[PDB]
Symmetry: none
């Protein structure tokens, strides 16, 4: 039993049993109070927050007769999502994402679950989730959520985790718009440094959902013990929502790529803005310096003193030269 | 039960009850007057504008016995279009899209409606809709919209909404037409800030349309309380169009996709072209200037004055070198 | 009249029957008017519509909407079909592209079919109706035995066939541009493409919305008899598909033209600087040294060192030459 | 009207199988394949050389096929689709092939029509991926004999699915060659080759993208055929096109990023020259200016009044050049 | 039978024979010493080094009746990792990579293996492998490897193989962080070369592992000759790795792909930065030297002498004009 997560602080127990009639919920740290709900007729949902605790799970897990490896695998926070099939229960590896705005940081939380008999087990590390509206449906008798069983109750949680990324979408757009305005007006250094932060976290997001599809697809392909009549209409929708994300990822991939060019295109303009100055100055002096060089040189036959008005006439012909090119300038280049 | 919308200004109600025989249309802001129309055997079409009113949503919902969310989710002005079937009513979320050509921006208004029995409730935040020609055929008993019930009206309402997207695409292309031309001829940075945001507007669009197919797809394969037969092929025609719509959207991206580089394409090439102009100037005068710079420097031995006419001969040897370079240039 | 041609003007009327035929050229505007109630379908040519006296007369003579007259006076307008209880106004263009220089001209052809007459309006001289005149002249086709209904289409189909030549015009220039860009590349090429690609976009400006224009009568034609012109519209639209595709076909190619052309010169940007560097970087050192002896001092090494003039120059030569080996090093 | 580029060869073949026995033949006779319209066992039919409008018209009118359905086949340039009917099934498909020698992707349309137990397959030229499919029909190998023409069609399409994977292998290998050239020994005109590949890659996306609807239309419906013995099978095929198209989008980024390597290589070697050009002119311009002053002529010359002036002038400016050396690369 | 490798130097053959009872091993380059152990009912692990030998590999291939082309394929050191299936034994193409951090080099080592009956063939290129701790378990009876057969050891070989790929990436991972710091701050020349080499080796990396993933799924779905599901679930562990490894490879691919263009905007922006200096340094002296060259010329009418204090005045006006350029600067 090895917990490799960073949350070893708080622990919490919550159990929500429901039926076509009533609803019940409580928060008791008692380990042996939530266990007798296992053989309950009505589907009994159980929450375990603060999964860092090995002692409680070691009692609860072995009260359910859970395979030893499955116990520690839960405590392992470094894992690629999957599903563990058994003759009694079904285990699934999941992840939750949280992106704090006004900052670029991607944190994750691994949620594990085991569906045995009528009981659904949700295992949390810290406080907070997107499965609160699910409880709202349970508590307020919203839909067929009171009638159906654990596999649907599980799907209700599965359906919620799907919407988790949809909520995360607007969180992404926030940092984009801030980064947008940085690029759109007065672009500067560290912007590209911020670009990578947005760019790196971008593909990283889809990278997680990518194998998670087959994790859910294999379920949608098999599920022998659970009712497939209920299953097929459930997961097929979730199976569709991954396409909604598949486009949504590329949606921002084009934005990040496109907006990146704007900061890059400005430099070319800025370069062109400067290289026009270096151009016009070099074109109005070096040819005239050539004139100053010839008369600067002294030869055998000197027409300067020979011809009348040798000195003043030199400035005259050069003055026009400086003008005629300006007319040729101030145009499209 | 909080309205987070940007329009809490005005509040409007309109009621239209019709049939193959009779017809009536009127605007009564009275919440009590529209209530007894719940038991109407004829299809009841009701307009409700100014959804900012929490009490009206509550009051109308109470008398109709509506779930809190179904009333509250409407007050939530930020929501994804979807469909929920019920034993009595049908929860539907829609999004009206509007675009102005002068100022480039995508403005929208969320639309939700509920259909139970013969009752239909259209909801709006602000004034304006595309259902004006719909009311025409209703009012003048034109089409089959009178002959059938609210179920076909439900289609007829959505039909006008889906049709609006086609017209919207027409405005988009012309904005692209002007935009794409500006980059071609004019390497000036004004369209650049316009493009990426106008591109973003189209990018914003596909985010809605793609999952919006489920709104059709759900009704297309199910409609348990609604009548069978007719309901599906009418939706099919729309479900066929929503394919063409989304395919039309992605097609537009290809234009803007490489159009961004065209801006950089001209600038980079012109910059280098300017360098070419600067190059040929600095390369021809300096060596010829270097010549006179040598004679500008004096020494003890000057063969130039030893052999007569050393002045004009130098002018000749320089003139050819400058020309033969220009000949070498323009290669 | 918003056009620029106020010079050339001509009036022609070719009235036919199932038996006989008549044609005449009378500059009098009042002369063609009594042909309105002529039992036989009367086709009328009006070239040089710049004259408002003919515009104002005919419009008031047939009772034509004032804006429709202005629509003819407006030479810059999208093709369309205007449905009315009596007549139908249609905007059409005649595309002509010379191979000598890149330019595509378009003359608007408006037509109004009312009662017993069909009107053709030309801005300047020239059309594709010369063989159509022959069909009215030589009794070729069903144009004689039918009324103004197919008589109008006989004018239409000839215009439809005109687009084919235009594709052949551009495609030839494309094939030339294929040889101009992909191989033997030079400047001003893109500028020719900048004219061609622009006209290519300018081409889709008309044809693409012209589909609905031809599709306007596809399912309608209210005053005239139907199902004769409908299968015509079918095959006519069968042609414009390949046309618009051919338009789009060139676009993808034309894109690949500049794209490869872009990286070509932008890579030579470095190559150009290679020449500008090696030339300018060998002068400033030498020009300075050759500019030293121009200065004045108390002690002169020029006179102190015998052969002061040639020795200094002789040694600096190789010092500038070794720069070539100093340069040219593989970057 | 046949607008295709293959009007040369033509061939007709019919493969009729059972759960026990099997028979096949090659007869160009148009009236030999028609009486198998009422064949109990599912009939598989191969027709290459769709340029012939007579057979398509003859066989089509024999099956009561709508002229437009026969006309859509005559059109060789078309987007894949699915059209359900109360009797038969009409589906349009495409075949893509790439050669490594010259960078180009050749295309071919396959329009199949399933009516009851009769399946039609139409081609322009010789060559297909249905050869290993025939083997199972030939050797009584697998479930393919037991199930009907619906699973046959499923298998026919299923075989066409993996064809893209192998087709994806081609471009990825071309990428590998492109990975080599752009990075190692960067070369001009390679972008032109790359831009063609870009044009080739986008060209492929035109088919697979609406082909999702092609698969989704079938999979989520199947009105005439047996649903539960067909629908879950279409899924895996409908699942693959997601896995396929995602791999397609993957290459789009791969080639895009590597395309900028050659671009980045140029600007770097460009700037490589610029920094050198800078320090050359910047040092002599002030120095040349100084000597140019003493070259000027006036009424008063203090240079002669400067004791030991000449040796120190060239020396005092000698330090100015030195302090700029360390200043370089600050 | 053509050897295409670079190691024609050394040769060695080790044979490790064990059972559920004992263990025994020997190292004999003699060909006819390792052959009679073919009919051994006990699992026999046979090392094969000196793959340059076309004759012995043939001879052993002759002794086992191995297909001639397969023998040449073993002699072929240029091949995609795959599995050649046979009715009795099984041929598999594999690779072993080694990377040093000092000099960036990804070297390749192809090891083919064939398990016939109880005999295990392992074709080495040169001396040494990562199977050193694997030999300990066979020798010192460490684990259930003794109680099980060589088919279980067959997967135990993959363990040493895959564990290398883990450490391999861990070695390679060190360079990216450094290359980042090279790109993020203090960017310079040769950075592209490191960006090239590390990515180039990474290209070679996926080019090997990605098709090597098909090796497992080839057997994992079947394993026809050996025991099924008594070997298959072991593959599932590496099956998780071979996908995650290539994704961890893909991780480095995406990072380097992004790390590259950051350096592009780094230089290109600072390219103009130096051009700012060259512009303002040159353009100010362009007229100055020209002005000095004006009076450098000589004429019949010289107003310089006509103008009192001609020398100090001219040098005075050029003092302020050159300075205002920096004030004329700071525009855009």
């Amino acid at each position: 039993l090895v917990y490799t997560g960073k949350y070893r602080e708080d622990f919490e127990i919550e159990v929500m049993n429901y039926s076509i009639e009533e609803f019940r919920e409580f928060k008791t740290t008692d380990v042996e109070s939530v266990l007798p709900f296992r053989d309950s007729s009505t589907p009994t949902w159980i929450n375990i927050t603060g999964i860092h605790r090995t002692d409680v799970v070691q009692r609860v897990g072995e009260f359910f007769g859970i395979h030893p490896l499955v116990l520690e695998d839960i405590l392992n926070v470094h894992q690629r999502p999957k599903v563990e099939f058994f003759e009694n229960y079904v285990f699934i590896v999941l992840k939750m994402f949280t992106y704090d705005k006004n900052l670029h940081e991607l944190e994750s939380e691994q949620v594990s679950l085991i569906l045995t008999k009528n009981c659904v087990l949700m295992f949390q590390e810290k406080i907070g989730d997107v499965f609160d509206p699910v409880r709202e449906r349970i508590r307020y008798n919203r839909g067929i959520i009171r009638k159906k069983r654990a596999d649907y109750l599980l799907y209700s949680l599965i359906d919620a985790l799907v919407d988790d990324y949809f909520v995360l979408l607007e969180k992404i757009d926030d940092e984009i718009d801030v980064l947008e305005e940085e690029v759109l007006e007065r672009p500067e250094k560290e912007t590209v440094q911020r670009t990578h932060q947005l760019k790196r976290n971008l593909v990283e997001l889809r990278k997680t959902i990518w194998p998670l599809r087959e994790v859910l697809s294999s379920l949608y392909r098999d599920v022998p013990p659970l009712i497939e009549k209920e299953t097929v209409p459930y997961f097929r929708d979730v199976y569709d929502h991954t396409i909604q994300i598949a486009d949504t990822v590329e949606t921002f991939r084009d934005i990040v790529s496109g907006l990146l060019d704007v900061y890059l295109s400005s430099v070319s303009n800025k370069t062109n803005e400067v290289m026009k100055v270096l151009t016009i100055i070099a074109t109005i002096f070096m040819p005239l310096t050539f004139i100053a060089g010839i008369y600067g040189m002294n030869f055998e036959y000197m027409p300067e003193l020979r011809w009348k008005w040798g000195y003043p006439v030199v400035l005259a012909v050069m003055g026009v030269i400086a003008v005629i090119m300006v007319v040729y300038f101030k145009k499209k280049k």
